[PDB]
Target: Cold shock protein CspD
Amino acid sequence: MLEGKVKWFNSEKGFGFIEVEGQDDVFVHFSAIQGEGFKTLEEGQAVSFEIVEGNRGPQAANVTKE
Model:
């Protein structure tokens, strides 16, 4: 699992970017967010996650709020 920080997140639209040291920023969609409750992220929130890449390029998967 990768560790990173939420760079920014549009809570209304349900998407943002995770920033991570060395690597580029990682697009995160709300459907990647684990746990219970309404799925959203806060700027600067610590997350653990993976990067999954299909034919639309890399994005965050299995994002867990730490």
The chain has no helices and five strands. The two ends are 12 Å apart (CA to CA). Residues 9 and 41 are 6 Å apart (CA to CA).
